[PDB]
UniProtKB/Swiss-Prot annotation, chains A, B:
Residue(s) carrying N6-carboxylysine: K97
Effect of D53N: No change in catalytic activity
Effect the entry attributes to changing H131N: No catalytic activity
Residues given in the record as Zn(2+) 3 binding sites: K97, H131, H155
Miscellaneous comment: GATase (glutamine amidotransferase) and CPSase (carbamoyl phosphate synthase) form together the glutamine-dependent CPSase (GD-CPSase) (EC 6.3.5.5).
The gene coding this protein: CAD
Shown segment, full-protein numbering: 1460 to 1821 of 2225
Entry's localization field: Cytoplasm; Nucleus
Official protein name in the record: Multifunctional protein CAD
Effect on the protein upon substituting H14A: No zinc-binding and no catalytic activity
Length: 362, 362
């Protein structure tokens, strides 16, 4: 009755530690990951302090080693001051994150020349990922070509963006991309229900035509990733709502529903939540690690999932078919039927495993 | 000084056992694989008897389990009589092999309708690979679309073929392909040296323009695979030369030379000899497995490599930079500097590992 999947990987999560632990911490965010059938996460650097230098990375690594329940890697963040300074720690990170649209004064880059400087100084064998919306996708692709290296585009959300990436791939350019579940399963049609606070997300929800273009161009999508961006309901419904949705606990149930409906195959799903994340980010295998899912159980997403401290979900009310029943991580039962069974600190930094270093020429 | 690589995978080898063991056997062919930095091979079914039914597969599995020194999976072969009969053993094979051009009376398919029948009856979640040259590439792609599933094209050798596959990928069709080293590093210019016997291979050596098109379209190539096709020198130089080159021991040195010359990156190589083979064929990770290579040592390929019983090589005289120094397979030293150190039978059938079954819906 159950289907055994390999350990799934989410390459785009915000776990809020250090500095935003009321929204989520490593322990709660990785519990959410396990309950969503995810056994490895890559955590983004827009924490407080942001992970933009070696001291901040060192702090975040110890906090994750002590709090994470699943395995992880941590991104470094590009700033207006750190190009050329990250070489000694670069290989210990998941990759480098560029925030190319509206952002915090610390990750903010004010000039494309600063993007160039990062592409030129970051080690050429290590991953670079970009938050790049609309024409910014084209712009960062140009910078990647000028510096003759690859780039990965986060959360593609629009017909415009997926078709641009499609055209770049047709020209043989080294670009990969990911799509988040809210851009496949929500649209403008849902903003009346969500309201302008809860509905705030970046990239914003697309039109029906945007959603249909992403599905029609599934072949262009290399990865799914949640962009798990937990904020409390008070923050989402308050005066200055921060953008973002929680998504770790809902991503796999949503996608399994789509598999059961024949919208994509099980293999299509596993390429995008396992094999392609591995190969783009050079993430190591996890020994004795698997996820058991039940594809027959129909349920309705409630007003909040059990684990994320966000304590809300934009998918409330959607019917899904597909449940995570059991997760085994490195030989230990990590999750069964609504209970996480590995403690904070069980998770490890995969970049410290010998098989987790990115291969490079001498 | 040494570069650590993961365990490399060759998805296209002919190991000649059962029935052609003077050309190669599991023990000698997997020694050649290890000396070439390969830790897992997928063996083709055109043996004697050919692996076209459950009894033949059972025999080949035991012979491989007893003789293989590295890990393996075995292909089943499509015949004019076995469509609809392989369902119980299909999941235990690497995949199904279709020989669509000139071949033996046992793997010979006389009608595209027989290709259709195989695409319709072989389990939809399991791999299908095709020897398909020139217009046969287009024909098998059509059959794949009619049956709405994927196909993998073996040894792409011509500008015509890579551009057709390129066009299919631009239309979002589920097709992958592999290229063999002789089609990247040899051409018509080498036939005078090789002669018409040694030079006989299928697909035949291409023109300079074919070779240049493959390099220019590297982005379209998903895998490298040797098409290791050992025949003795007596056979290659005799009256009716069989097509094929040995290649396990020369593939990685040739490609490392190209990396050192900047023709492709180390990552490009590892996508094509590790990550993409894994994800196309759902091959499991190998624990505690790695290859150490030396990228500074310049040497000239001799008249025969140490291990393959073929006892000849078409790459004789080429200068290479790159050597396999050490291979560790599942925690045991398997190869050092010209000596294989694991015995016949150390290798295992990866499809019997829990992590080596192809995931499928209930
Ligand atoms: Zn973002
Ligand atoms: Zn991302
Ligand atoms: Zn994000
Ligand atoms: Zn890798
Ligand atoms: Zn062939
Ligand atoms: Zn092949
Ligand atoms: Zn072959
Ligand atoms: Zn797989």
């Amino acid at each position: 009755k159950l289907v055994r999947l390999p350990g799934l990987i989410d390459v785009h999560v915000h776990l809020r530690e250090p500095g935003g632990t009321h929204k989520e911490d490593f322990a709660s965010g990785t519990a959410a990951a396990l309950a969503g059938g995810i056994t490895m996460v890559c955590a983004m650097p827009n924490t407080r302090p942001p992970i933009i230098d070696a001291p901040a990375l060192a702090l975040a690594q110890k906090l994750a080693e002590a709090g994470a329940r699943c395995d992880f890697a941590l991104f470094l963040g590009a700033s207006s001051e750190n190009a050329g300074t990250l070489g000694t720690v670069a290989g210990s990170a998941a990759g480098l994150k560029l925030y190319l649209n509206e952002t915090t004064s610390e990750l903010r880059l004010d000039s494309v020349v600063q993007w160039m400087e990062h592409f030129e100084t970051w080690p050429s064998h290590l991953p670079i990922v970009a938050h790049a919306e609309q024409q910014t996708v084209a712009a960062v692709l140009m910078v990647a070509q000028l510096t003759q290296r690859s780039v990965h585009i986060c959360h593609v959300a629009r017909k415009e963006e997926i078709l641009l990436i499609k055209a770049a791939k047709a020209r043989g350019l080294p670009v990969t991309c990911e799509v988040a579940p809210h851009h496949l399963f929500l649209s403008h049609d849902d903003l009346e229900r969500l309201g302008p606070g809860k509905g705030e997300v970046r990239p914003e929800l697309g039109s029906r035509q945007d959603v249909e273009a992403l599905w029609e161009n599934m072949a262009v999508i290399d990865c799914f990733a949640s962009d798990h961006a937990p904020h409390t309901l008070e923050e989402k419904c308050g005066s200055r709502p921060p953008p973002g949705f929680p998504g770790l606990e809902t991503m796999l149930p949503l996608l399994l529903t789509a598999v059961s409906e024949g919208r994509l195959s099980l293999d299509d799903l596993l390429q995008r939540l396992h094999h392609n994340p591995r190969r783009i980010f050079h993430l190591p295998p996890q020994e004795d690690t698997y996820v058991e899912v039940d594809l027959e159980h129909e349920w309705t997403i409630p007003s909040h999932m059990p684990f994320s401290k966000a304590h809300w979900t934009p998918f409330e009310g959607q019917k899904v078919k597909g449940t995570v029943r059991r997760v085994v991580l490195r030989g230990e039962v990590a999750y069964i039927d609504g209970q996480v069974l590995v403690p904070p600190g069980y998770g490890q930094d995969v970049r410290k495993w010998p098989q987790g270093a990115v291969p490079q020429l001498p």
